[PDB]
Structures are given as structure tokens and as C-alpha cells.
Amino acid sequence: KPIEIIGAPFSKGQPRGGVEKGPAALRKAGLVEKLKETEYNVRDHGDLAFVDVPNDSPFQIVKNPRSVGKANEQLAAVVAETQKNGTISVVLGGDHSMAIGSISGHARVHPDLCVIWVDAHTDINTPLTTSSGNLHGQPVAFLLKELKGKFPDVPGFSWVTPCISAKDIVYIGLRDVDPGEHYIIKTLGIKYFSMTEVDKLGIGKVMEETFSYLLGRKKRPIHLSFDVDGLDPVFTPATGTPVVGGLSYREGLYITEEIYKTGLLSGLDIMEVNPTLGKTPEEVTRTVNTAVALTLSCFGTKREGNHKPETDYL
Amino acid sequence: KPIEIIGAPFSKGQPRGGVEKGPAALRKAGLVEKLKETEYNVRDHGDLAFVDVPNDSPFQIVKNPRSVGKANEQLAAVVAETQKNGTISVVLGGDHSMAIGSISGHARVHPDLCVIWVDAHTDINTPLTTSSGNLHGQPVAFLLKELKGKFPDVPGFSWVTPCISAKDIVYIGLRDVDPGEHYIIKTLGIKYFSMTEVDKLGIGKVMEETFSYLLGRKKRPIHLSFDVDGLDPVFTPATGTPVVGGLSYREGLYITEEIYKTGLLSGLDIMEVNPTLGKTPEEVTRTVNTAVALTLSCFGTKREGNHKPETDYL
Amino acid sequence: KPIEIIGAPFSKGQPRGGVEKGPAALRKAGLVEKLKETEYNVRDHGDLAFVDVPNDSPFQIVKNPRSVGKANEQLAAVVAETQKNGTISVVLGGDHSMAIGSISGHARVHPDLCVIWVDAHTDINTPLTTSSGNLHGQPVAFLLKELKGKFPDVPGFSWVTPCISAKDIVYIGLRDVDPGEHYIIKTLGIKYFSMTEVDKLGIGKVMEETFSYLLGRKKRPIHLSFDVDGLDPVFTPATGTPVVGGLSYREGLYITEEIYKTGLLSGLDIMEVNPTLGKTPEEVTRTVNTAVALTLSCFGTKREGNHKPETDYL
């Protein structure tokens, strides 16, 4: 199967500069080379160049709506294109608001996909419920069919078409939800495993449930949107919104190891890596390495080991 | 329901200076303000002023018996008073020896309470079994009915009345128990979940058991005495007696999260926070922050999120 | 029952200087005195003096084969001798290549023993499948009957006799396995619990399974070969090959606590402690202390506590 890495050095999704450097960092760590060592064919599409919308006035509270809307529309085009060619797309973030187009594009080619969202945050605030106008905290609100029209249209997002329903998404790692958001997920009946459920059940039982819940009936393409801030700050400190008591390096790899095993991984997002937010160079190396490892894990690398078929090492 | 914060800036329960500053640190973090943001009514009673007993000679090995005895007597009066007004009492330590009065007062108004003791220690040494005369390590020995008269009376504790039996207490996090203590808990049949039981069972099953064991028959008021050194030193390093391999930040919040859900929380103790024992300012912030979080967790705050009832965020 | 500590200050099993200082560090921490405090009789045999083979030319890629071969031959003699006298042998390493003779000797007296190998590495590379000629990474390859003759004879190991089969060994902690090794363990059907299986199952269910798998049918002597690099670097940083995402301090003690309870522990190895690899004195103290703790745990010390029989502490 083929893999296509797509860089999305975007940052207007939130106030902290640096996320745009995310893709450069991840590549600097050899993410592309290390992937070629797997059983997948890898092609790097390079980084997309986002045209900056001049005079992007705030919509009520939302910030840089036109810049974010255009960047995502551009990405969705590219993702749809690679998915059409039957390749698995791997989007390297900036911030998480690039998920709007990543999932959208994907949806265009595979309308029956399910979303597994590893994050400490739900990112489901609507333009009306955000305390900050930061869109990196509103991606899912633009994608949910059930949330259609429950908020005014936003300059630059007209092209978006709610592609997934509250039934096609599962959150893992939830632990810093806003009141509005918590209302939304309880009201819409969205399935989620907050840190307290992971503690109660074990990462193993959790993964087991999420699959029977999203794949119980029909086997379908999987879109993994992975917010690096889902793991505990001790593992991925280089993020804009770290929250303590998160997923461990082990749990993170388990999730990715389980999703590879399903053979259904169709789309991936490695978001929020911010190379400039590392307090010590090591903290950045820690964060990038982890991200890289998780990605490699998504495509085959197991902790038990890997050996090439048909080769007799004896 | 109402909450009453009572400061117990006491430290003669042990040899390390600084615990008395515990309450000041905890408040300095907004513990009171953050609580008000919950669905409970909060009233800060302020810190109690403990009169220092002059010429407090050691009773055999026990140190500052009269000072500790008087300080607890005073606190028990105050706790009894607020419990009477049907308010939930939240005691902010210095050292754990203030648990004698905190639970005693509580017991006077609710004689059918059960105690959940999260600690790395049993604190059940008798005046006869302590290697050190430190009373912060003997609190439960003064409160257990089964231990009545199994040791000589101590100057300043005459007022104490053993209020709870070996059947009304459950330990969670045990991992540094003295021989004498381990004899006591094995002999008396006290229920406990040492770190090995947590590892074997999972924090989830543990909490489940402790409840069916203490509430299986009669639902009763719950007194949570939380020694911050029950969590691993990596989370709460600013304590006098840190012991490696303890409960994680996650497991701590799960305990508090489950106890809130029972709706039975009647009394609480956040002990051993010692702001002067942090090697770096951060270590102290870490420790205070997690103590604050645990407390907020006891009164509602969930990691999955919180939203105000009757408010339509849409 | 009697214990016999045997020092193996050997290091030619790998490139890094220092491991030979392992036994000295462990004693320096009071390992022998602390053991005497247990219900076992302890006898320190002292450190073996290994004669250095001059002109030890590399066998193809394998390094210092004659020195490693002779050192292990000597140890196997000593271990055989103490096992014969019905004592439990506890070998203190240098590197893990000393397991060859540790297990070999053991096997001579107890040919029906099973091996529990806690390590982040399988150490099953053959002289033909090593990227480095480091023998500390080929111990099991010299001990497995199924691997006999699957590689050329190595100068210094003629005395070795494959004593255990792929059925008598269980790995716990695997997370950095080479391709050749992963082929070998998959091909031979070797039972293992890589970090992903620990995450999935929980240390408790893992220990449960390894026992029914190795002791389900016949109860037999147990040889615990413990590579300190099996725990995460945050617990035992002073080792030549640390790999992140390893077993926790708690999980390590659980394993040892469960093995003690079986009453079958017959041989032990505490390998890879390298006092010179600690970045800060504390890192070395951390690593030594936890190795000492694990060892004490193997012989009785429980985290729930210990009291002496027939003594009435009341």
C-alpha cells in the first residue's frame, strides 16, 4: 500500500507561534526515511503553501476565519486527490484546525469513514461557544452533521460539508473539556473514553470497545486524528496546550499498534507539535521522537519486533 | 450543600519544619476561589491558632504530646461544630497527626462514618511501637477502638474517644509499613490495598471493592483522609516522607472522582503538604497544584468535563 | 532456605566500561545486610576473579569470545556447586552474557527449570545474526536446544550444552528486538509478553499467564534472569542500553513479589547495572536502589508489610 506525507505548516488555528514548524521538525527527525523502512511505499508531497488572507477580520469571536477556511479548503483538495489514488494520507500539522480539511477531503473519497480522535481536548466548540476564538478548538464542530446550522456561517468555511455524524467518532484521552463542549458531547451522545475511563478500563479494554463500537457492524476506513497533547506533558511537552494526567507513551503506542492491526488505517493526522515551545532542546527532541514513533507504529513497527518475510535469518 | 475550609497549620506531629505553611500555600493557589466555581457553597473558616504548650516533655518516646493533644482537641471542637451545621468539612494540613481531631470531631456528629485513608503509610503505630516518637505516624492508633488501652495514656489525649473500629477503615496506597504496624493491621483484620493490590487489580476494581466493603450493607458518611505522600514523589515531591512506586496523578483523581460520585463525602483531609521541602519552586507548584486538583475532584470537577445545568450553550 | 550471592564483575559481554563495578555498587548499598534481615540464611561467596584471555581475536563478528567463554565456564562451575548444596544462587552482574553460565550451571543440578527473562531485549541473536559482536546480546542463543548448530562453534564455548528449550522460557518487557531475533522467537514459538501485551493485559494477568504456561503441568525450579534495563529509564537509567516505555518500578516489584509467592525461585540474576553510566550520582543511586529492592522482593519483602512469626507485637 502507498503512503503520502502532506505537510500543513499552519498555525492561525491558535495564538501560539511555532506549530507551523511542526512538519520541518518531524522530517528533521527522519520521519520520511524511517517510514521507507516499513512495508509501505512512501511518497512525500512536500509542504503546502498557504496564501495569507489580508484583512482577515474576526467573525464575532472567531479569529483569522478566512485564513483558516482557505488553508483547510486547500488541504481537503490535496487529501481528496491522494485518497482517490488509493493512497493512505498522513497529514503533518501545525495546529489541529487543519483537521477540518484533512477529514473533509478524506470523507469525499470515503464517505463511510469513522474518526478516532486521540486528544486531551474535544475540539468541538462552536463559533458561539468558544471563550477564545481559536479555531484549533472547533474542528469537529464544522465536521458534525448534527451541529449543522447550530451556529452562524463563518467567512471562509462555506465549502465545508458536514461529513460525519456523532456516531462515527470516538474520543480517547479526554480531560480538559469546556462546559459548552461537555454539553454538546452529552447531548449528541458521542462516544468517548476520558482519562477516567482509561483508568477504569485499561487501554486494552478501551481499544477493544472503540472498535466494536465503530466497526461492530460494518468494517470501514479509519481516520486517526492524533493530537500530540493527548499524551501526558512528560512525553510530549512541546505543545501549546499541555494538560497533566494524560496518556502514557506506552498507551499511545498501544492505540497506534491496535489501529495498524485492523488493516483499515486510511488517514492520519499528527498535530500540535510546536518545536518552539520546548523548555529545553531535549523537551523538543522528546516530543518529536514520540510523534515519529507513533506514526511508525501506525504503519507496522511493533514493540515485539519486526522481521522481513521470506528471509531466513539463519 | 455547604463546604467549610478549616486551616490546621500544625507541624509538631513530625520533625520537619514547613508543613504548617501548607494551608497558606494551598490557598495561595486559589483553592477557595476554585471551589466556589463548583456547585457547592464555600465558606473559609480561616486558620486555627494553636496555643503552644510550654515545657512539653516527651512521653517516653512520643514527642510534643501535649502540643499535639491540645491542637487536635481544638480542631475536633471546630469540626464537630461545622458538621453539626450539616456542612462538609475540609481540613488543610500541616502533618497527618491532625487527623486525630479531624475524624474525632466528625465522629461526634456522624458516629457511623467509614474512613478511606489514602496514604503510603498506615500511621497506626502506638506510643509503644514507634521507632520515632513522631505522632504524625500514630493517628489511627488513637482512633481505633480495638487499640484502646493497648498502650499507656498520653499527656494531652485524654479527651480522645476511640470512635471507629477496624471494620470502618480502608487503606489505599500502602507501601512503607513498619513491622509493628503490619502486625497490627494483619492481627486486627483491617482492609487495605497496598500498591501490590492496586497493581494486581487496577485502580478501578480497587475502588469498586472498597465501596462494597464499607457501604455494602449501610450507606454512611465517608471521611477521606488524604495523605499527599500516597501519590508517587514524581507528583507530590513536597512532602516529609516520600516513598517511590506510589499512586499516579491519574489514580489519585480516579479515587476522588469515585468518592464524589457516591454523594456521601462528609469529611476530607489534605495533609502533609510541605512547601519548604520542594527542591525547586516547580516541585512545590507541582505538589500544591495536584493537592488542589484532587480536592476540586472531590467536589464535582470531572476530567470528562462539566457544564452548568439548565443552561443551553447552543 | 539458604542464599548464596555470587559476584560476576564481568563486562567483555559488551562495549561499555563499568558494568564490572555492578556487584561492588550493589553491596555498597547493603544488599547483603538487607537480605540477612529476611527469613533466609545468606552467604556471600564474594566476587569471582576472571582470568583475561590474551590475544582474544574476534570470531568473525563476535567480540572477546574466549574471554566471555572462559568467564561463563568458571561461573557455571560455581553455580552448579552451590545449587548442588541446595542453596538458591543469586548472581550479580556485570553484563547479561554471564547468564550463559549462570543458567548452565543451574541446569546441571536442575535440568527441569524454566526461565523468566525480564528484559527489554530478547538477547537471542546468534553469532550469525548480530549487527554488533556483543555477546551480552546472544546469551539465550547459546542456551536454546532448538538453536543448536544453527551457527558455527565459538572459541571458548565448547563446554556449553543447550539446556533449555523454547518451551521453558518466557520474556517479559520486550520492546527493542532486532529483525533476526524477532524471526527466531516467532519461528521457534517462544512465549513472550512485549510491552504491548503488558499494556493490553495488565501486569497482573501477565504474571498469571506466565505461570500457568510454565508451571501449569509440572511445578519446577524457576530461574529469574533480570535485566535491569527492563524497567523504564526513569527507574534504572544507569544501564548500557536504556529503551523508553519500559516496565514501571511497581510492575517490576509485582513480578518479583509474584515469583516469591510461588516458593519456587531457585536462581536469580541482577544484570546490566552500570554505575559509571549514571548522568548524576542520583541516577546511579536510583538504579542501584531499585535493583536492591527487586532482589529483596524476590525473597519475601512485601509492599503490604512484613512481621516476624511467633512474635506478639502487642
Ligand SMILES: N/C(=N\O)NCCC[NH3+]
Ligand atoms: N489544545 C486545544 N485543543 O486541541 N485547545 C482547545 C481549547 C478550547 N477552546
Ligand SMILES: N/C(=N\O)NCCC[NH3+]
Ligand atoms: N509520613 C508518615 N506517615 O504519614 N510517616 C510515618 C513514619 C512511621 N513512624
Ligand SMILES: N/C(=N\O)NCCC[NH3+]
Ligand atoms: N542491552 C542489550 N541486551 O540486553 N542489547 C542487545 C543488543 C542486540 N544486539
Ligand SMILES: [Mn+2]
Ligand atoms: Mn488537544
Ligand SMILES: [Mn+2]
Ligand atoms: Mn486538539
Ligand SMILES: [Mn+2]
Ligand atoms: Mn504518609
Ligand SMILES: [Mn+2]
Ligand atoms: Mn500519613
Ligand SMILES: [Mn+2]
Ligand atoms: Mn536488556
Ligand SMILES: [Mn+2]
Ligand atoms: Mn539483557
